[PDB]
Amino acid sequence: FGLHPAVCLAIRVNTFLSCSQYHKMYRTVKATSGRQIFQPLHTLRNAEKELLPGFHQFEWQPALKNVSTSWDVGIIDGLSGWTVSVDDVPADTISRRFRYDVALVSALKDLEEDIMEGLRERALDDSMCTSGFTVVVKESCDGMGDVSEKPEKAVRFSFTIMSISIRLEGEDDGITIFQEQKPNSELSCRPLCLMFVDESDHETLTAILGPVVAERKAMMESRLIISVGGLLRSFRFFFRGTGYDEKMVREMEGLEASGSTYICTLCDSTRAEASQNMVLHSITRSHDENLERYEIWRKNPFSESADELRDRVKGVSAKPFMETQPTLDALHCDIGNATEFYKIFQDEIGEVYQKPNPSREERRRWRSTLDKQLRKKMKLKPVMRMNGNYARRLMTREAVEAVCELVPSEERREALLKLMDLYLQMKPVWRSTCPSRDCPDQLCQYSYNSQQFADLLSSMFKYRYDGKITNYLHKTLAHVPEIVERDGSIGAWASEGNESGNKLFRRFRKMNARQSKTFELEDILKHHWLYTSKYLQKFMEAH
Amino acid sequence: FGLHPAVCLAIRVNTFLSCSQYHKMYRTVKATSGRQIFQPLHTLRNAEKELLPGFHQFEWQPALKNVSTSWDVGIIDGLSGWTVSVDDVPADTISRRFRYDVALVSALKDLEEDIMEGLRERALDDSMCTSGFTVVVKESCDGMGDVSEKPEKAVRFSFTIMSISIRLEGEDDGITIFQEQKPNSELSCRPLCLMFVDESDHETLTAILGPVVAERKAMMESRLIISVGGLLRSFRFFFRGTGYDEKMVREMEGLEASGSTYICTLCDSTRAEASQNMVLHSITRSHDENLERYEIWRKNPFSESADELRDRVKGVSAKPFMETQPTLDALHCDIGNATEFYKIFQDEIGEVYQKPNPSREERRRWRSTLDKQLRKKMKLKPVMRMNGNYARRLMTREAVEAVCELVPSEERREALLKLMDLYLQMKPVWRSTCPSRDCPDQLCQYSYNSQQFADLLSSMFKYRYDGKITNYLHKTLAHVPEIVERDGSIGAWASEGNESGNKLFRRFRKMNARQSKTFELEDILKHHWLYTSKYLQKFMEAH
Amino acid sequence: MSLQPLTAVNCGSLVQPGFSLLDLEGDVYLFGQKGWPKRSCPTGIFGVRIKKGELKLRAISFSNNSSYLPPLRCPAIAHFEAQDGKPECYLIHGGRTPNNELSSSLYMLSVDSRGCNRKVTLRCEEKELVGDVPSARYGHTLSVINSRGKTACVLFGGRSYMPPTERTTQNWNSVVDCPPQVYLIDLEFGCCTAHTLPELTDGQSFHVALARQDCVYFLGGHILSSDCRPSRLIRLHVELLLGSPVLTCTILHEGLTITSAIASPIGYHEYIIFGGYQSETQKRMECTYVGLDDVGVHMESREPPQWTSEISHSRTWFGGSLGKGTALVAIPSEGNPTPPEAYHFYQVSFQ
Amino acid sequence: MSLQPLTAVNCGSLVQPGFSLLDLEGDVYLFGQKGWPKRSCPTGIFGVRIKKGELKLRAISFSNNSSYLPPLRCPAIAHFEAQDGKPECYLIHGGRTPNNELSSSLYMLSVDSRGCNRKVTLRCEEKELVGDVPSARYGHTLSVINSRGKTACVLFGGRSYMPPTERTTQNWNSVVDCPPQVYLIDLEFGCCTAHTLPELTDGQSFHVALARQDCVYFLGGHILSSDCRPSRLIRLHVELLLGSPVLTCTILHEGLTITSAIASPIGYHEYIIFGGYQSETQKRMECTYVGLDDVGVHMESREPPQWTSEISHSRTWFGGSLGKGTALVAIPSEGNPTPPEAYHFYQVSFQ
DNA sequence: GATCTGGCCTGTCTTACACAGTGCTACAGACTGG
DNA sequence: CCAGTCTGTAGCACTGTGTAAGACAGGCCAGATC
DNA sequence: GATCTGGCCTGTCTTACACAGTGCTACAGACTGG
DNA sequence: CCAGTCTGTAGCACTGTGTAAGACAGGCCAGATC
Ligand SMILES: [Ca+2]
Ligand SMILES: [Ca+2]
Ligand SMILES: [Ca+2]
Ligand SMILES: [Ca+2]
Ligand SMILES: [Zn+2]
Ligand SMILES: [Zn+2]
């Protein structure tokens, strides 16, 4: 059998194969055995041309806000036409990207297969499902450091279709047509913009991302018209932007960073007012009200002093410009909790509420004997930082009864036992893929579980939490049930997705670049987008 | 219809494909279309096991000199058992290699196809061609610098089967059974030893190469018994070692290096005695007499002074240890001649025999006006060294009449015209692949052409060649007819072959290493040997 | 006319190619830091001291009744000269924020109290502009004037983004010169009044201005439209014949073909011009001197100090006027390793 | 007992971990350069000067009647003490050439004339060895003796390559200790005589020796066979009761467990031992002192000077004895970049 | 009215960790022929 | 039904690369003082 | 008898050049249907 | 028999990487000298 040209494109991209190499091996297998097993080069590229964005004609109702209507543009030069005159801020920065709209329609046409399969399964009619569509889009931006070559930093903006549901025609609080099953695996994290800048400087980052932001702020208004399965249908869109680490969350949101005194990203509590009472707070922070607060800072309509207004406005000091859902990142989410139980135990080996002034060395003694201790029982070598593996293995009731062995009193043992027990009861409530289905039991108990945890910390270990509270802990104790109810999960929006993409990017720089930085980006982006299309994974079945 | 496993191995190696990548693409093409187009992994490696050295049982008549008879050893650790005891010279140096004999028999059994084809063509019988075989082996060693990775120098010893002829049973001055047609193309330059050392230091280089040298010195004595085409047959061997640049030729030969006063590697002439009379010399230098001369130096059996013995022995100062055919290298062979005609012209623009003392600047003036001149007519940008391309294009009668344009006198013009004419008459005599066939006309004239050239240099331009002669020029004017008659060609032994192989080695280190320097060299050597076997090129036909 | 290579002791990652230097009451103030105001300096304005070639920066504080300012990057500064009512002030409008948006909101900066111990207090009153407001833009120029006897401000020039009809997300960073309608800004109230003149052929950008005794002179600037930097010096004469601000103009013969210049006032009306860029590719290397009176500009070519080879062989460079013939210039340090304070500073002084 | 870090002014790529220092007539001579003799030094022997921590090397010349020597690497040196016939000499045999082959030919090195101007003349007479010849080997030891009253040489120890039967091109760099038959070399003529002793249990390697008044003491060395470095000090007493050189020996109690030692003579028979390596992995760091007389060795542990950090934390190191308590040691400089003179030198002296 | 130091805050370097690829290897698991 | 025989996949041994979590210092401000 | 300088010579840096790879592109050639 | 049409192969534009041919310099030695 001759082989499907799409399969050949996938087998060139899905395994990082070169282009010359592919041609040489194709000529080999051609000349050897009597058959055209792999399609030739030019026809493979031609067969690819409809997978990239910029091929499927579409319509928009109404016309978009300040967005040209052309539907065939490919890779736009990211500079967006900087007047190169060297008297202004330089036109140096190199970047390449698609247009948001066209990339989205390309991905949607890709997913046409699964949307039609879901319409078949749900047994919904076809002449009656042309309007009520609802697509959730999870975006994610990050900085990638030190591209490995002998052009150091980079930023990569990537979005992912999270869930598509139907609306026609009743109340339909939810009719899940397609819920992506691997929202973290980089196999589905579509790049949309690449920029050879550094994550830090707010100038060039905003200067290049601006157009994408305008696309976002224009697109949530109108609705989309796309011909799929022979029927032209209308789509809506929600943009639950989550894919940011805390630092970028603040930089986009305007608050100072990072070791601030306005810890929470959702409430308005400072260090103390949350340290004292932990688990009693409500979600307040919003994007629009953060704009409002920034206005109240800039105009200072009450003539208060510097620190006076800084307190009145809750640290808002810079005009935010990218609406971000302030959701906890379940990826780390525990290094703080882990090292905090670590400090609890390093202050349990020595009696800390009877010796509240250790030396530079007595804590060294207690941690070192704790380290040899947990090497004895749990076989955990000394580490520098609470990475994921050590965090998982240490935060166990086994190691808790192991740290019981060296603490003299027998009431502290039971206290830390109950603490670790409630904490393990409450961890998978947030790390689950969907606690609405995996384990809603601990979710319904999470409020009371967390309150007992807070009461135990405030009655037993408040020797340290008078006015001090580690950042992660506030969000993990106060808002978690609220967040889970607000979204439906926590782990199902981790930035880590785009994080796993990082490898791919640098890998694609080593084997498929042009290479000359005007074209190098363009080609890396093209190959990435090829590698992350549901179509060319459906052909790599590998049963 | 499945594919030949040998073809699949070739298509994994002949295009630098990885190992994981190959498996992934194989699983893809398997699961997609109904057939097993590429063999699986373990059976491919199993099918390869007979291509590497160390598979075909062979015999040696008689038993070799101090060489263990075992015939199945694979990749030997190169150090050959250095006593790791720290007090001695360190056992650090890392190297890997085959055994000379086993690698040779592997390559021969590879070439079994063409040897049987040649026995078919020449119409020779089969029951009467079991003894008289004659294999010529061209070896080549060199240093490769700065392996490019995130272990700086390296040395690579490679041999190549040059020509195999028959001996049964008459006089048979030559019965060419197989004459390799690309004796320089890296596609046939088989690596045999690799060492992570530096080219310079004689110590470790000799320390590791020693065993190979002892092998070769033992191998020219006996004969080889190998079963090919069902018949077991006996082979002889000649080793025309040529693959060395001048510097290594000296280091192995013992003479000082490099800008010595004993220029020639064949005669005994110094700068002067060859400068006065150029083209009247006879090839003298030999390996055994160089050993003898080194003995005469060491014992100093005539109590002569330092310089007096240094003159009596013709620069022999170090015990040579690797018999090397003293052959001209056709690769550069002209950069000296090129820059020498360049100096001729830079001293013709000025009148040099009337102004034998130019300034630091007058020569700058003359070269610069010559450069603008040849930019006007021959379109040759100023360069800093006489590379290959500039040497080809400049050494032309056109550029010679172009340099006529600025020289005032009209007799010097005709002199340099005849000079360049004879030089072009004599260049392809040596750069040919086989002047016995390509152009023997100029070969029969080469003695007379060279003498006219020498007479013209001594009558016209001897203002510079009183006692000065560029190294290359002596070998190009004195022994070229002698050399061509000695071997049959000049270009057909250029080291450049292994030189091209260099750009392979780095490549293999970048995509196929293990990598950890114990196994890294093993893997690189294995893949190189796979890539240079006539068998797996016969399968990459590519008509 | 001499240079001394300075050094960045600390606080060096805080100067960007577009910035401003406010010269008033001794010490000078840096304005327009890169990135939003940190916690170390909740205002953003810096104080800058120069001590034996060392360039130190200290954190200014603010008043209580004042507003807080976003660090505009390439705005138009105007020394509202010391006089009634509250001397002495700086008018700032409007530049573009560290998010690529523009102000359209002029600010009045003044000093309040001191010291006690080498300390200052500043205030930044947002002053509303009514009208007939001017559009937000960057690179234009403001300049104070005073005539019989009213004190007003003349504003002209400047690029902007495309007006929000064809502003497309493939041209969302292209710029075009604002329409040349000079604005007149009355400080109290902000009754801005725009006017036009048939001599305003095309609005230019980055064109240093000089106002004296109700007569103003605009020197050479940059123009994107014709892509030429014209040599036509411009003069304009305004007069508040209440209730009408009647304005006229005049082209003159010679106007230097330079853009992005650093003007240092030495005398009462003596201005030494270092100048940034002559052509669109090679920056200028020489200097200039300009007097002015009711006659006009008196040109001169003063002594061009020999710049180091490093500065002369660099593509771009910028800086500000320390005032009183002293001025600071800076070059992007091109080489490894990026410090990352990749801006080397030179202090340059007249005579 | 103090160290000074020296430096390589020039000619630094010419010292290799195996080398020798000939101490005679003031200045000392370096011997055993890496790589064959260049043109700059047609002999190979160098003269070494130490001047305010600087280590300079100059090119010695030779006689006319003498042979020319291949730069052996780790040979056995023997100070043929100043006496009849032609004082004072060095006996060198036999090491291994810069091609991995061995000499089996002893050389006598002597001085001829001087200066005129800070110049020397040397001679290297190849002295034939008849017999009963010794086998070529490296790391063994030669020493001079004088017994009633004949001056002879005792030679013992040493590794070699496998004898050329099982010498295979997979073992062509393996070594095995020579058979322990001590040799006696008569200097003229070379009527060498082999002898054995039933206390010569196993021939060792790199074992520093000390000969005095026709009685010799062999200290600890290395052995590959048992892979142990035994502590059994050896003594042996030879006597030429013509026409028979009758020899006996004796094991003694204490012999230091060190190999590759640097012995400096200070007194008439006082030898300070720096020592290279205690165990097969960690080199020794301390020092030792050894007197000797007709009683035997008198041991002592003198003051071990504090070494620097890098010399103590390095794997290997070597050197020679400058003579008169002065000695040179060197460490392979391990770090980026390789100079390529990657051997740092320290001068170390007693008292 | 003018000057120095402990507190602490934060921007800077560094180093333990995860983990990426790569060939080789061994186990389990599943086909297929008796 | 059962064994042999294949085959896919997981796991091992190894350095090299990014990361960012802590080491930290030092420098300004408040404090403590001249 | 002892000390410095042009000659030259060779070990060290450096920089013009060749070329490696990569994807994109255009022509030439060879098949294949009329 | 010839047009169309595909396909392979050559060539283009770009920077990174090794080489080694010359720049050189300085340092010793001979000479030139104190
Ligand atoms: Ca990241
Ligand atoms: Ca981050
Ligand atoms: Ca070479
Ligand atoms: Ca080479
Ligand atoms: Zn909160
Ligand atoms: Zn010759």
PDB file of C-alpha atoms (C1' of nucleotides) and ligand atoms in Angstrom, chain B residues 142-143 499 502, chain H residues 20, ligand 4:
ATOM      1  CA  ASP B 142      45.858  12.378  11.238  1.00  0.00           C
ATOM      2  CA  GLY B 143      44.863  14.610  14.110  1.00  0.00           C
ATOM      3  CA  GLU B 499      40.604  14.502   5.998  1.00  0.00           C
ATOM      4  CA  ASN B 502      36.896  14.334   9.901  1.00  0.00           C
TER       5      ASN B 502
ATOM      6  C1'  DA H  20      46.272  26.872   9.418  1.00  0.00           C
TER       7       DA H  20
HETATM    8 CA    CA I   4      44.132  17.694   9.232  1.00  0.00          CA
END
